[PDB]
Design a protein around this ligand. Sequence first.
Ligand SMILES: Nc1ncnc2c1ncn2[C@@H]1O[C@H](CO)[C@@H](O)[C@H]1O
Length: 172
Amino acid sequence: GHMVNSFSGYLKLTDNVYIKNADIVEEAKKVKPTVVVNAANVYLKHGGGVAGALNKATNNAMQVESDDYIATNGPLKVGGSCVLSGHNLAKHCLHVVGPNVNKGEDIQLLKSAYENFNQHEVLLAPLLSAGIFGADPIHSLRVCVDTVRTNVYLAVFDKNLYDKLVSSFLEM
Ligand SMILES: Nc1ncnc2c1ncn2[C@@H]1O[C@H](CO)[C@@H](O)[C@H]1O
């Protein structure tokens, strides 16, 4: 009934990593997690992917807040994060920058990116550096599982990708 961080329909991969075929925006709206993770760039310019979807669900409040934050502080580091408002989706949004391997950024920074998750007991998150950032999503899930020690609920939008991640994980 009425709780916050109530996750449902996740496959338990390990003691602390869960995965679901779901839209992270729809999950955030239902669950109202303490922390939702944004797949951000260093400029917190929420064009496309997860960032575009989260911002649109806040009616652009996330972009307004992000514009103010970056004008004040300057860009993040690749592999870095910042905690900003979760607006109407969550208590907080953890903006995490994975490497963009399509722009020749170092894949090693994906581990740094996931390390940010360890400062929060429970997160709703997407797979970092997958899609337009061009990392292999199987590799991103492996780095997540090997790096994150806190409770992470992964939302994978694409049915085929979800099925491929689960089959490859539970047969290794
Ligand atoms: N709304 C969404 N919810 C969850 N994952 C998403 C969403 N939109 C894109 N993705 C996936 O997130 C990854 C990049 O952040 C890619 O695998 C991409 O398919």
